Every structure is written in structure tokens, then in C-alpha cells.
RNA sequence: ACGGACCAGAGCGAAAGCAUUUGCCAAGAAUGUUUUCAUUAAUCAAGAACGAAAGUCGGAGGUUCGAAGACGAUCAGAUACCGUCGUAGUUCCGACCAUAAACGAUGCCGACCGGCGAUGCGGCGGCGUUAUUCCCAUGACCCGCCGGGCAGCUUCCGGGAAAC
RNA sequence: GUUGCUGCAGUUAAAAAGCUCGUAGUUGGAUCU
């Protein structure tokens, strides 16, 4: 039918790793940034390479590939990913804790912890 | 690219009982030529630049010139 | 024309390592043939011990292919041992040949009286196991030479020991295990500890620890 | 009277019994099967799609996570909750709702947690399931808004709040009675069943408990005193040195441990349906077994398939001459 | 800990261990691990020793410091639980990050597209990630990693007796031996809390995101 | 080793496991040089110096040399008592 | 005549072997022992007991089955396969006989060298639950620890032509 | 080191008796300046 070739997509990939600033979703923006860069020969195989990369990030908007690895991912992924909340999810008002564990910290000099509560194995 | 990279020839040895031909097909490099191989590549290879790196920006700076 | 791609491999192309010694002595893996062909150079002389062809089962039928057994050794201190397979005969042996410098190892050399001179035999009776073949090396008098079979003759001849009582058990016939065995048992003899080695080893800085400042440029 | 997924997948056509039908667009869409969403293409569309505010959101999360729920729900499922709130919140007045719920009363039994109550066909001492019982088959069954919520994570903080809300059935929904699994090790109960990894320390040691939920917005857990449940039987065994590769199958130790690709060929994981308009036509009763494929001679089995052979402890006596997979 | 006041885990600490969970280990167990237990409970859990993680976290912060270039230091996470975690380590530290699947041949192969040489490696769960440990082996590389109760010990260096099973565990032990690198280096006071929360060292999970993204 | 003369007549001097005192050998691959840094007993900081230890491969292979370093460490007062 | 199902990688027996109840007869291991004796032992040519099945003499007995054998079917050539019947035998008693892939295809006694928890027997220490809440001990469960068992899983201890 | 005292073997390659007792033989725990 029309399945891409080994060359073609390693082309593509190599593109995708080196220039991902230049691209796009549109894919005539994809066509002239390809015959500035690489030497490529002529069209045929000027246009399979410029066609497999528009379709390769879409689907990074689909979340992750499995091919390619630049540290970048655009300006959210990186957003999302240095995230912290408003107060850390370890200072907690009451932690529920075993005997044995209170035991534990009795033998190690902090018997005299205050945010405990130990729970009985009912 | 059969045409302009390899190279054919086909000639004949005389031994004493039979003939032996012999086809030596060179396949030539690239480099546009200084005397040395075609111009144009295989139409199957491909080559990607590296990229001249750009500055990452740090402040908004006009520098009139 | 040489490019480095370990690191080690890097120091080596300069002059950051000495010798062949400070490889060995923090055991760090030589994966490029250039640096034992650096350093040694010229000295590395090599045997080819076997050319057996074999014919390989494909679904294409059989076709002959050539197994090479090359025994590379420096005199007088260096011997390694490398075993391929190949469709020519040329390039077996200097695949072989290849593999026998990444596989280079150190020998041990002692006395047997009373130590005068330069050593000569293996350091105390030592041995290799390697598949049904038990090789013995037996440390000989001055000037008794290599008393054994040819293949060891050669192995021991390479690493420059001058003398040697050889004993072998085992199918002794089957090369590469003869070989590899008597290889085995001449690694092994800096592996063994005697009274020389007694004293606590001070630790000098890693050839990666040392030139960390010089590895940053590269 | 707001729509959950599960009000779409019973195909609960209560488009009769309100007016104030509104749902997310996103629940709709992410339906996968095509009877449901065959359904969705033809029915009385007086369905309306709505996105509520970002500070009802904040206010349903506030306190989901007081509840302990909020682990267990989706981003969809917040969704619904603040769908719910905010439209009570438009027409009827918002001072019924409660913010911060109930102290949990602990009331412990002896019985097991396994015992069959709450299953509709078991029976101890009639309880039969009939042609009349079929439709009957729902909950514990009890005026302008309410949900459709099948997911019990849902109805729990729905009724935490004191937000009236119903079933597949006609009328309001009282008690709702369901089981959770309580971490034996951390305490942070989760209200997903399917999970065998507690979300908070990771260890396999989550146990079930059965918990009610009534209209006025108490909770009370059953916990179980019976030592059979917390016994250290086949916990400690020698496991395999870790193997890597295609086929090296490790022994399931984490919820995200990345396993080989071990998929069953489809000649293989195809069950016969004999209710099939066209089954008569095929030649022989069942559908044939795989066993030309390498999924088979690899024995790749299925992960319900090899269940209580899992449950037995690894220190017993297997018989002399089988060897578990 | 060289028996110093200075080093020595403090009640904060602890109530962020408790916090996360890394004194509750598995319920399996390694005979090779025992010496780092307190004692099992008769509910089948094993607690871990948490003076005796805090001195192997100590070691580890001490091994990682003793290396001039943080670039040599390679660490790893295969699984998931770690992969923000072991980023942010690297981001702190200097170190080198091996997220996701580490390609077999990394540390071996010298004609490979990422052939790295460390001086050291740090991995996550010597069960997940048995395959770099693997590969350290042949080049070299002393090994820390964070061990659970049930893991086997097989060329683990240094090795950290926590829970790293939970994903609250294995990202706070990470953020805690970045803290306790940086301490050590002297780019950070000791007596003045660190600005970093450990928070941002959890693991993020998809669906939370989305959940997260509603609330603001 | 050592001639009558008294020159050092081999080519290394290899050196041993601070674990089991066996020797690292040439081909030890799974051998390491482990370097463990000292602190200020005030400051609580690196100093410049550390204390090595080396195990060789058939040790780490068994999976004792953690408890090797552990009880190293403890002998030079790295690890405390307890 | 035979003792199913319960019947296990459970037990016991030197091995061959050994399974309905009850009673009698004499043994036996393991365990517990601040009991006694004080080297009395280990292995063992000659020699001596026991030794599945089959077979052999003598008596008794023949239910089933059943070599032999007889019929019946079945075909270029069928004389083994299959069916019906059926002798010795298979059953017991007293003598013989002494071999089996009598198998762990792995001498016996002893020392050392990793780990794990299930089980069987005995013992020790334990909060509890159960004998309609038992009134005290005792039984049945549960958590451990000890010794000898029959086994198992795991381990780059080391071995090994190798599977192991 | 294919007769093996030094120095062989006996899972599957040729090989450990069916099992136990047992006369000779060989071999036998420390412990006394």
C-alpha cells in the first residue's frame, strides 16, 4: 500500500531530534525547512521525509514517543514537570502509625514525637 | 545510480587451454569533483547539517548598530 | 589513522598512561586493539597456532568458513590468545589476531633456586582448567627450557618464561581447550598469592580519578 | 439529574424520568463499546453538554480528599461531582450541603471478608434469583436534581455532602452498601477494587472491608476479627534472580514494573459465544485451540487464567510431578 | 554518620520518612537485607531500621561527593516511581540521568550511539533495574542503590534499606540524598532548611496531572 | 618477586581485596576502587580527603561486599557504633 | 475375593514391603533426661538371617482373573492384534527356590561449606480463640524456637562431557 | 594418571553387591611438664 521506508523514517526521526524548534503542525512549513538544512536529493524523497514528521507530532501531542528523546518537550511538558503544590504532601497534621513502629522510634530517642497516632490493630 | 557509480569492463586473457574473462566493477566515491567521483550523491543517502547553535535568550537587549 | 572512543583509550593517546602496568593494576577492561598495539608496538610478534576450517549448517547448504587460533606474545612479559571464525583465511587471523591483543594479560615470572639474575619460570606450580583439559605448569631449573607439548610450548615460548615442567591431562588432542587452558593457568599466576604479597596495598588515584580535570576538554 | 458514564453502559433510559438532563462532553466520548454509543446516536437528544466553574471544582477536591476518595476517582469523575454541585447550587439552595463530613464509626465483626452476603443467588438457611427477581437486581433502593452513578467512589462523596442522588432505578438511593480495601501497613484506604497495590506505599497488602453509606451522611466500616486474614503464612519465600529478555516472566512485585510483551494469539483468545444468531451453521460446537502459534508452545496464559494457583503459599508441596508455569 | 552531631538525622527527617513510608518495607525478605530490619510484625510486614537507612544514605551522599566530575556519576530509573525524581536528582547534583530503558551495551559496547563510562552508578530497585547493575559489573562501576526488604544484594555496593516499593519512598529518598550530596559539597547550609520541597521529587502519574489541572 | 641483589623485579605489584585480602587480578572486571569521603567534624563538610576500598569481584558476586563496606566503614569510624 | 473412596511427595519398616474394627503378644525410631556404663566403636573376606513377582514340591481351597489350550472372526501370503470359553496358576497352610530397571540407574560411617519456609514426629516458650461464654487443668486451632525425619523452592559456593 | 602407593574411576559413558548382621583385616575421641 503505502508504507514509509527504513531510510525515510530514520530521516525523519534524525530531523525530529535535531530541529524541533523549526517545525510544525502545518505541513508546507515542514517542506522548506527540510531543503536548508539536510542535503537531500530531489523531491519524491524530499516530500516523504517532510510527511512523516508532520504526522510524528501530533501524536507528541498525543503525549510521548517511543523513538525519539531530545530534553526539550516544548513549553508545557516542562511546566508540568517542575510542578510543586502549595504545601508538601509529608507535613501532615496526624500520621497513624503501628505499635511496632512507635516502638521503633521509642528505641532510637524520639519518644518524645508529637504528630503520632498509633493505631491498634483491631 | 548503476550508471554512474559502477564501472564495467569486460576483457579477455589468453591462457593456453580456455579463456578466463574478468569484470571489474568499481564503485566510486562521492565529493563533487576535484578530479574524483560525481557530483551528485545516491538519491538514497541523506545528510542533516548540525545546527549552528542560536543563543539562548537572557534579557530583552537593544544594541543599536 | 587512530580516533579514541573510551576513555581510557583518550589518556592513551596522549601520554596521561605510562605503561601497560597501570591498566592492569586497577583492572579496567581494554576494549580497543590500538592500545596494546601502542604500547607493546613492535614487540608483539604472533604464532598462528590452528587454521581448522569448518563447513557451517545454513539454509543456503554448506559453505566453508575458517576457524584461527593466534597466540599474540610480547617476550619477556605479555601473552594473550585469540580464536575466530571468517569466510577468508586472512581475515580469520587478523580478526584473531585483534582479539588476542584486547585479551592480553600480565605473567608472573620467579625463580627457582636462589633468586639471581632475571626470572625465568613460573612462580610456584600453578594450573589451568578449562574443559576436560588440565594443564600444570611446574616451575624448572635454570635453562631446562619448555619441557612440553607444542601448542603450550609456543604459549609459554611467547610469554617469555624460559623454562617450565608441563604436565597435561584430559583430551589434550581438542586445540582450543589446550590452549585456553594453558592460557588460563599463565593468567593465573599473578592471581596466586605467596609470601611476596603480603604487604597492605596503598592506593594510588585511578587513571579516571587522576586525569578527571583533562577528561572535562573531552 | 446528571449523567454518569455507567447511567450510558447499563443503558439506564431515564431520559423520561427528568428534565434536568445534563452531562460532561468528555464521559460520552470516552465510552469504547458501540452498543452504547449506537444508542447515543439515535436516542431523544434533550441531553445538554456542560463544563461547571473552577471554583466548585476546588470546592468538590477540598474535601474529597478529607473523605479519602479522591485517589480512588478520575479527573472526569471531579468532573461529574462539581457538574452535580453547581447545578443544586443554580437552582436549589446550597446551604443543605455540608463541607468537612463525618468522624468514621469502627465496628469490627468475626466474620470473614469473603463470606458471600450481599451476593444475590447465595443462601444460607428464600433467596432465589427468578424471572420476577432479574430487573429487581440493583442495590439497597429507597426531587429536582440527582446522579446516575454507578461507581460507588462517586456516591460515597456525593452522599458525604448530602447530595440526593439515585441508580438505574426510579427512586433516591439511601444506603449504599459496597466493600473497600484498607493498607494494612499505612492505612490509606482506596475505594478502587480492581487495585492489588496500595497507591500510598506500594506493598501488596490491601484487604477488604465493607463500608455503608447512608442519605444523612455517616460512614461505618465492617472490620474483620479474624486472624485468618492478617496471618503471615506464604509472605516470606525465596524469589528467582531478577532475568531480563523477551520471555523472562518476573514474579509481579510492583504496580509499574515493566513486563515483556506477552500477548495470546487471537485463534487463542477466542471464546465461543453460543448464543451467536449464526453458531448453528459452524461444524463443531467449540472454537478450535491454538497450537500451532509460539504464544502457545511459549505457554502464555492469561492473566484470570491460573487464579487460586497463585493463592496457594510458595511453601507447600506441589504434586511430585507438576511444575506451576 | 562518623558519630558527628552535625550529620546526625534530626526529628523533621523522620517525620517526613513516616510521612512517606519508607520504615514500612515488603513483606518478603532477603536474608542478605536482615542485618537493616527492626523485626517483623505478626501482620507480615517488615519494618526497616530507620537509623540504620539514615547511616547507608550518609555512605552513599559520602561515595557520590568523593567524585570530581558530577557528570561521571550515572544514575539510573527504569521504572517509573523514579523517573521525575531521578531527573530533579540530576538537575541538583550534576549527575548523569539514565531515565526509561537503559539499552543493553551502555556501559559495554564502545560502538554504540550512547556508550557512557561512569565512575559510579546509582540505581533505583536492584530488582527493576537489574540489567545496568549487570553491566557495571563488567566495566567497573561501584554501585549504590535503594533496596527494599525483598532485593537481591548481588553487586550492590552501598546499598539504602528503604521502601521503594511506594511513590512517595522513592522520591523523597532521592531528594534526600541530593540534599545530603549538596551538604556535604558545601553549596548548601546545613542549619538553614533546604529551599527545595520534596515534593517536586513524586512521581507526577498522568491522571493526577488532569486532576490537578482542574484545581487552580 | 624480589631478587638476592635487591631490585623489584616484577612488572606490578597487584593490589588486594581490602575484604578478603585475596588478590584483584589483571582480568578482574567485576573488581572495584571504591573512594569514600571524610568530613569536617565541626562543619560537617567534605574535606579533600577520602578513605578507598577495594573488593574484588568474587566477593561482590555473592553479594557480601555491602556488608564488606559496611563493616569497613564502621572500623575507620565513618559508620558509627550502632 | 478383596479391603476402595479418606490415601498426601503423609507415615513406618534393614530391604522386600506395609491400610476394615477390636483384643492380645513382643519389638522399634525420634524426642526429654544435671541417669548409668566409660571406648564398649566405623567398615567389614569366611560365614549367617530376611529377600516382590514368577516357578517347584507336599496338603487344603477354588470368587474373579488367567499363561497354556480350544473354538469364533480376519486375508495376494497370516499362524500376532480382537471376541467367547477356559487348564496350571492367582487363595491359605508347611517346605523349597534367591532372582527384578530389588532405582536415587547414585557404598557405608564421619567432618566442613549459602539461604528460605511448609510438612511429620517429640520437646520448649508464648497473647488469644474454641469444648453451647466451659468452674480449674486438659484436648482443637494460632505465633514462634529446638532435634531427628520424608520432601521442596531458590542461589555465578564450588563442581562437572554435560544434562545437572 | 589406559592398573593409579605417589595418581584413575563407578548419575547418564564399562562399573555400587537386594538388604541387614557378622568372624578375621584395616581403622579408631580427648586427656598425663
Redesign the interface.
Given at each position: 500500500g503505502r508504507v514509509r521506508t527504513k531510510t525515510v523514517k530514520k530521516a525523519a526521526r534524525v530531523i525530529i531530534e535535531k530541529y524541533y524548534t523549526r517545525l510544525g503542525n502545518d505541513f508546507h512549513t515542514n517542506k522548506r525547512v527540510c531543503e536548508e538544512i539536510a542535503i537531500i536529493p530531489s523531491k519524491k524523497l524530499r516530500n516523504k521525509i517532510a510527511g512523516y514528521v508532520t504526522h510524528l507530532m501530533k501524536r507528541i501531542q498525543r503525549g510521548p514517543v517511543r523513538g525519539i528523546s531530545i530534553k526539550l518537550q516544548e513549553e508545557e511538558r516542562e511546566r508540568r514537570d517542575n510542578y510543586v503544590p502549595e504545601v508538601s504532601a509529608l507535613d501532615q497534621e496526624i500520621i497513624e502509625v503501628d505499635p511496632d513502629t512507635k516502638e521503633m522510634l521509642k528505641l532510637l530517642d524520639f519518644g518524645s514525637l508529637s504528630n503520632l497516632q498509633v493505631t491498634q490493630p483491631t | 545510480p548503476v550508471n554512474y557509480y559502477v564501472d564495467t569492463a569486460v576483457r579477455h586473457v589468453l591462457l593456453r587451454q580456455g579463456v578466463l574473462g574478468i569484470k571489474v566493477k568499481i564503485m566510486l566515491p562521492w565529493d563533487p569533483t576535484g578530479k574524483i567521483g560525481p557530483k551528485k550523491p545516491l538519491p538514497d543517502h541523506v545528510s542533516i547539517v548540525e545546527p549552528k547553535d542560536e543563543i539562548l535568550p537572557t534579557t530583552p537587549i537593544s544594541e543599536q548598530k | 589513522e587512530w580516533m579514541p572512543?573510551?576513555?581510557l583509550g583518550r589518556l592513551v593517546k596522549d601520554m596521561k598512561i605510562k605503561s601497560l602496568?597501570e591498566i592492569?593494576?586497577?583492572?579496567?577492561?581494554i576494549?580497543?586493539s590500538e592500545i596494546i598495539d601502542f604500547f607493546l608496538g613492535a614487540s608483539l610478534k604472533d604464532e598462528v597456532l590452528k587454521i581448522m576450517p569448518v563447513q557451517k549448517q545454513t539454509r543456503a547448504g554448506q559453505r566453508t568458513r575458517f576457524k584461527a587460533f593466534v597466540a599474540i606474545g610480547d617476550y619477556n612479559?605479555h601473552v594473550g590468545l585469540g580464536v575466530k571464525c571468517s569466510k577468508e583465511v586472512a581475515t580469520a587471523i587478523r580478526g584473531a589476531i585483534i582479539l588476542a591483543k584486547l585479551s592480553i594479560?600480565?605473567v608472573?615470572?620467579?625463580?627457582w633456586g636462589?633468586?639471581?639474575?632475571?626470572?625465568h619460570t613460573v612462580?610456584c606450580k600453578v594450573t589451568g582448567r578449562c574443559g576436560s583439559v588440565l594443564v600444570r605448569l611446574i616451575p624448572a631449573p635454570r635453562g631446562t627450557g619448555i619441557v612440553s607439548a607444542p601448542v603450550p610450548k609456543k604459549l609459554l615460548m611467547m610469554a617469555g618464561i624460559d623454562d617450565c615442567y608441563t604436565s597435561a591431562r584430559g583430551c589434550t588432542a581438542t586445540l582450543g581447550n589446550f590452549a585456553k587452558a594453558t592460557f588460563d593457568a599463565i593468567?593465573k599466576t599473578?592471581?596466586?598469592?605467596?609470601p611476596?604479597?603480603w604487604?597492605?596495598?596503598v592506593?594510588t588515584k585511578?587513571p579516571?580519578?587522576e586525569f578527571?580535570?583533562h577528561?572535562?576538554k573531552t | 439529574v446528571v449523567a454518569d458514564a455507567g447511567a450510558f453502559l447499563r443503558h439506564a433510559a431515564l431520559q423520561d424520568i427528568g428534565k434536568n438532563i445534563y452531562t460532561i462532553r468528555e464521559v460520552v466520548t470516552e465510552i469504547r463499546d458501540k452498543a452504547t454509543r449506537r444508542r447515543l446516536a439515535v436516542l431523544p437528544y434533550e441531553l445538554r453538554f456542560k463544563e461547571p466553574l473552577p471554583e466548585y471544582v476546588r470546592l468538590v477536591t477540598e474535601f474529597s480528599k478529607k473523605t479519602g476518595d479522591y485517589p480512588s476517582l478520575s479527573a472526569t469523575d471531579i468532573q461529574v461531582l462539581a457538574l452535580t454541585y453547581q447545578l443544586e447550587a443554580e437552582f436549589v439552595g446550597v446551604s443543605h450541603l455540608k463541607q468537612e463530613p463525618q468522624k468514621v464509626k469502627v465496628s469490627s465483626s468475626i466474620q470473614h471478608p469473603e463470606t458471600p452476603l450481599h451476593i444475590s443467588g447465595f443462601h444460607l438457611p428464600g433467596g432465589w434469583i427468578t424471572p420476577s427477581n432479574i430487573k429487581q437486581i440493583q442495590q439497597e433502593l429507597e426531587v429536582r436534581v440527582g446522579c446516575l452513578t454507578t461507581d460507588f467512589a462517586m456516591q460515597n462523596v456525593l452522599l458525604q455532602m448530602g447530595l440526593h442522588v439515585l441508580a438505574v432505578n426510579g427512586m433516591l438511593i439511601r444506603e449504599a452498601r459496597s466493600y473497600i480495601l484498607r493498607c494494612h501497613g499505612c492505612f490509606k484506604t482506596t475505594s478502587d477494587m480492581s487495585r492489588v497495590f496500595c497507591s500510598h506505599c506500594g506493598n501488596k497488602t490491601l484487604k477488604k472491608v465493607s463500608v455503608t453509606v447512608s442519605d444523612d451522611g455517616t460512614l461505618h466500616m465492617h472490620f474483620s476479627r479474624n486472624p485468618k486474614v492478617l496471618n503471615p503464612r506464604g509472605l516470606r519465600y525465596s524469589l528467582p534472580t531478577p532475568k531480563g529478555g523477551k520471555y523472562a516472566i518476573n514474579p509481579h512485585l510492583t504496580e509499574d514494573q515493566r513486563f515483556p510483551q506477552l500477548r495470546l494469539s487471537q485463534k487463542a483468545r477466542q471464546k465461543t459465544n453460543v448464543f451467536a444468531p449464526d453458531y448453528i451453521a459452524g461444524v463443531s460446537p467449540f472454537v478450535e485451540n491454538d497450537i500451532s502459534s509460539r504464544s502457545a508452545t511459549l505457554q502464555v496464559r492469561d492473566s484470570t487464567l491460573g487464579a487460586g494457583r497463585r493463592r496457594l503459599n510458595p511453601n507447600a508441596s506441589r504434586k511430585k510431578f507438576v511444575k506451576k508455569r | 554518620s562518623g558519630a558527628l552531631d552535625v550529620l546526625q538525622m534530626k526529628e523533621e527527617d523522620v517525620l517526613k520518612f513516616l510521612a512517606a513510608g519508607t520504615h514500612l518495607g515488603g513483606t518478603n525478605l532477603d536474608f542478605q537485607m536482615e542485618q537493616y530490619i527492626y523485626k517483623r510484625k505478626s501482620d507480615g510486614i517488615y519494618i526497616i531500621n530507620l537509623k540504620r537507612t539514615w547511616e547507608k544514605l550518609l555512605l552513599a551522599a559520602r561515595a557520590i561527593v568523593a567524585i570530581?566530575?558530577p557528570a561521571?556519576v550515572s544514575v539510573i530509573s527504569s521504572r517509573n516511581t523514579g523517573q521525575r525524581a531521578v531527573l530533579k536528582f540530576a538537575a541538583a547534583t550534576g549527575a548523569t540521568p539514565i531515565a526509561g530503558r537503559f539499552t543493553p551495551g551502555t556501559f559495554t559496547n564502545?560502538?554504540q550511539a550512547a556508550?557512557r563510562?561512569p565512575?559510579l552508578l546509582v540505581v533505583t530497585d536492584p530488582r527493576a533495574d537489574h540489567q545496568p547493575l549487570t553491566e557495571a559489573s563488567?566495566?567497573?562501576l561501584p554501585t549504590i542503590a535503594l533496596c527494599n526488604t525483598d532485593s537481591p544484594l548481588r553487586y550492590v555496593d552501598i546499598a539504602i534499606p528503604c521502601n521503594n516499593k511506594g511513590a512517595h519512598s522513592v522520591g523523597l529518598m532521592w531528594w534526600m540524598l541530593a540534599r545530603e550530596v549538596l551538604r556535604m559539597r558545601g553549596t548548601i547550609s546545613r542549619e538553614h532548611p533546604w529551599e527545595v520541597m520534596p515534593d517536586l521529587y513524586f512521581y507526577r502519574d498522568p491522571e493526577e496531572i488532569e486532576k490537578e489541572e482542574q484545581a487552580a | 618477586?624480589?631478587?638476592?641483589?635487591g631490585e623489584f623485579?616484577?612488572?606490578?605489584?597487584?593490589?588486594?581485596c581490602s575484604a578478603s585480602?585475596?588478590?584483584?587480578?589483571?582480568?578482574?572486571?567485576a573488581?572495584i576502587?571504591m573512594?569514600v569521603a571524610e568530613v569536617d567534624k565541626v562543619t560537617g563538610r567534605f574535606n579533600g580527603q577520602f578513605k578507598?576500598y577495594?573488593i574484588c569481584g568474587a566477593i561482590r558476586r555473592m553479594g557480601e561486599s555491602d556488608d564488606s563496606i559496611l563493616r569497613l566503614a564502621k572500623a575507620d569510624g565513618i559508620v558509627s557504633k550502632n
Amino acid at each position: 500500500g503505502r508504507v514509509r521506508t527504513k531510510t525515510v523514517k530514520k530521516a525523519a526521526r534524525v530531523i525530529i531530534e535535531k530541529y524541533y524548534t523549526r517545525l510544525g503542525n502545518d505541513f508546507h512549513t515542514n517542506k522548506r525547512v527540510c531543503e536548508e538544512i539536510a542535503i537531500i536529493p530531489s523531491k519524491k524523497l524530499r516530500n516523504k521525509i517532510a510527511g512523516y514528521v508532520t504526522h510524528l507530532m501530533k501524536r507528541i501531542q498525543r503525549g510521548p514517543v517511543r523513538g525519539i528523546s531530545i530534553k526539550l518537550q516544548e513549553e508545557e511538558r516542562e511546566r508540568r514537570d517542575n510542578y510543586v503544590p502549595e504545601v508538601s504532601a509529608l507535613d501532615q497534621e496526624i500520621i497513624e502509625v503501628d505499635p511496632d513502629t512507635k516502638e521503633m522510634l521509642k528505641l532510637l530517642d524520639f519518644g518524645s514525637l508529637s504528630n503520632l497516632q498509633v493505631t491498634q490493630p483491631t | 545510480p548503476v550508471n554512474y557509480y559502477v564501472d564495467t569492463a569486460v576483457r579477455h586473457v589468453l591462457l593456453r587451454q580456455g579463456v578466463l574473462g574478468i569484470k571489474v566493477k568499481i564503485m566510486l566515491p562521492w565529493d563533487p569533483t576535484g578530479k574524483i567521483g560525481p557530483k551528485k550523491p545516491l538519491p538514497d543517502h541523506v545528510s542533516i547539517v548540525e545546527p549552528k547553535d542560536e543563543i539562548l535568550p537572557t534579557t530583552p537587549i537593544s544594541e543599536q548598530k | 589513522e587512530w580516533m579514541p572512543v573510551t576513555k581510557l583509550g583518550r589518556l592513551v593517546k596522549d601520554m596521561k598512561i605510562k605503561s601497560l602496568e597501570e591498566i592492569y593494576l586497577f583492572s579496567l577492561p581494554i576494549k580497543e586493539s590500538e592500545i596494546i598495539d601502542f604500547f607493546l608496538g613492535a614487540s608483539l610478534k604472533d604464532e598462528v597456532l590452528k587454521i581448522m576450517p569448518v563447513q557451517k549448517q545454513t539454509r543456503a547448504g554448506q559453505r566453508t568458513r575458517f576457524k584461527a587460533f593466534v597466540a599474540i606474545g610480547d617476550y619477556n612479559g605479555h601473552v594473550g590468545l585469540g580464536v575466530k571464525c571468517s569466510k577468508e583465511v586472512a581475515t580469520a587471523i587478523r580478526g584473531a589476531i585483534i582479539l588476542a591483543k584486547l585479551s592480553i594479560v600480565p605473567v608472573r615470572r620467579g625463580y627457582w633456586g636462589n633468586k639471581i639474575g632475571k626470572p625465568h619460570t613460573v612462580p610456584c606450580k600453578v594450573t589451568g582448567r578449562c574443559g576436560s583439559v588440565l594443564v600444570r605448569l611446574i616451575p624448572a631449573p635454570r635453562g631446562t627450557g619448555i619441557v612440553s607439548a607444542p601448542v603450550p610450548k609456543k604459549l609459554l615460548m611467547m610469554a617469555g618464561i624460559d623454562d617450565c615442567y608441563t604436565s597435561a591431562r584430559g583430551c589434550t588432542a581438542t586445540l582450543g581447550n589446550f590452549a585456553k587452558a594453558t592460557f588460563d593457568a599463565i593468567s593465573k599466576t599473578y592471581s596466586y598469592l605467596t609470601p611476596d604479597l603480603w604487604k597492605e596495598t596503598v592506593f594510588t588515584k585511578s587513571p579516571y580519578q587522576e586525569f578527571t580535570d583533562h577528561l572535562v576538554k573531552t | 439529574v446528571v449523567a454518569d458514564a455507567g447511567a450510558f453502559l447499563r443503558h439506564a433510559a431515564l431520559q423520561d424520568i427528568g428534565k434536568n438532563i445534563y452531562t460532561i462532553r468528555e464521559v460520552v466520548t470516552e465510552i469504547r463499546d458501540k452498543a452504547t454509543r449506537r444508542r447515543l446516536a439515535v436516542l431523544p437528544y434533550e441531553l445538554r453538554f456542560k463544563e461547571p466553574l473552577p471554583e466548585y471544582v476546588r470546592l468538590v477536591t477540598e474535601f474529597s480528599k478529607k473523605t479519602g476518595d479522591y485517589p480512588s476517582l478520575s479527573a472526569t469523575d471531579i468532573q461529574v461531582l462539581a457538574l452535580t454541585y453547581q447545578l443544586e447550587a443554580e437552582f436549589v439552595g446550597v446551604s443543605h450541603l455540608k463541607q468537612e463530613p463525618q468522624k468514621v464509626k469502627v465496628s469490627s465483626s468475626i466474620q470473614h471478608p469473603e463470606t458471600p452476603l450481599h451476593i444475590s443467588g447465595f443462601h444460607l438457611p428464600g433467596g432465589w434469583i427468578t424471572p420476577s427477581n432479574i430487573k429487581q437486581i440493583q442495590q439497597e433502593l429507597e426531587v429536582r436534581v440527582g446522579c446516575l452513578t454507578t461507581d460507588f467512589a462517586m456516591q460515597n462523596v456525593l452522599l458525604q455532602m448530602g447530595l440526593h442522588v439515585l441508580a438505574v432505578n426510579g427512586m433516591l438511593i439511601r444506603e449504599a452498601r459496597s466493600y473497600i480495601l484498607r493498607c494494612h501497613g499505612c492505612f490509606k484506604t482506596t475505594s478502587d477494587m480492581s487495585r492489588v497495590f496500595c497507591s500510598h506505599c506500594g506493598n501488596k497488602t490491601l484487604k477488604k472491608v465493607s463500608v455503608t453509606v447512608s442519605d444523612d451522611g455517616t460512614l461505618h466500616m465492617h472490620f474483620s476479627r479474624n486472624p485468618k486474614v492478617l496471618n503471615p503464612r506464604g509472605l516470606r519465600y525465596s524469589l528467582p534472580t531478577p532475568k531480563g529478555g523477551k520471555y523472562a516472566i518476573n514474579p509481579h512485585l510492583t504496580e509499574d514494573q515493566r513486563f515483556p510483551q506477552l500477548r495470546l494469539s487471537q485463534k487463542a483468545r477466542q471464546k465461543t459465544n453460543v448464543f451467536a444468531p449464526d453458531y448453528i451453521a459452524g461444524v463443531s460446537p467449540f472454537v478450535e485451540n491454538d497450537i500451532s502459534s509460539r504464544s502457545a508452545t511459549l505457554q502464555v496464559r492469561d492473566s484470570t487464567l491460573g487464579a487460586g494457583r497463585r493463592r496457594l503459599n510458595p511453601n507447600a508441596s506441589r504434586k511430585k510431578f507438576v511444575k506451576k508455569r | 554518620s562518623g558519630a558527628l552531631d552535625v550529620l546526625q538525622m534530626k526529628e523533621e527527617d523522620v517525620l517526613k520518612f513516616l510521612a512517606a513510608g519508607t520504615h514500612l518495607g515488603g513483606t518478603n525478605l532477603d536474608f542478605q537485607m536482615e542485618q537493616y530490619i527492626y523485626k517483623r510484625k505478626s501482620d507480615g510486614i517488615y519494618i526497616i531500621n530507620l537509623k540504620r537507612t539514615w547511616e547507608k544514605l550518609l555512605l552513599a551522599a559520602r561515595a557520590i561527593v568523593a567524585i570530581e566530575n558530577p557528570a561521571d556519576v550515572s544514575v539510573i530509573s527504569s521504572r517509573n516511581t523514579g523517573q521525575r525524581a531521578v531527573l530533579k536528582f540530576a538537575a541538583a547534583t550534576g549527575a548523569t540521568p539514565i531515565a526509561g530503558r537503559f539499552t543493553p551495551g551502555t556501559f559495554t559496547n564502545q560502538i554504540q550511539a550512547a556508550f557512557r563510562e561512569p565512575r559510579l552508578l546509582v540505581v533505583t530497585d536492584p530488582r527493576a533495574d537489574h540489567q545496568p547493575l549487570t553491566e557495571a559489573s563488567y566495566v567497573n562501576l561501584p554501585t549504590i542503590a535503594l533496596c527494599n526488604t525483598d532485593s537481591p544484594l548481588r553487586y550492590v555496593d552501598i546499598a539504602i534499606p528503604c521502601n521503594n516499593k511506594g511513590a512517595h519512598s522513592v522520591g523523597l529518598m532521592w531528594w534526600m540524598l541530593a540534599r545530603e550530596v549538596l551538604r556535604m559539597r558545601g553549596t548548601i547550609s546545613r542549619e538553614h532548611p533546604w529551599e527545595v520541597m520534596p515534593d517536586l521529587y513524586f512521581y507526577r502519574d498522568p491522571e493526577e496531572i488532569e486532576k490537578e489541572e482542574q484545581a487552580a | 618477586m624480589q631478587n638476592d641483589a635487591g631490585e623489584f623485579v616484577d612488572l606490578y605489584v597487584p593490589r588486594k581485596c581490602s575484604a578478603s585480602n585475596r588478590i584483584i587480578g589483571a582480568k578482574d572486571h567485576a573488581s572495584i576502587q571504591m573512594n569514600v569521603a571524610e568530613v569536617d567534624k565541626v562543619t560537617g563538610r567534605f574535606n579533600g580527603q577520602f578513605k578507598t576500598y577495594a573488593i574484588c569481584g568474587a566477593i561482590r558476586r555473592m553479594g557480601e561486599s555491602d556488608d564488606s563496606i559496611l563493616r569497613l566503614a564502621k572500623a575507620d569510624g565513618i559508620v558509627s557504633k550502632n
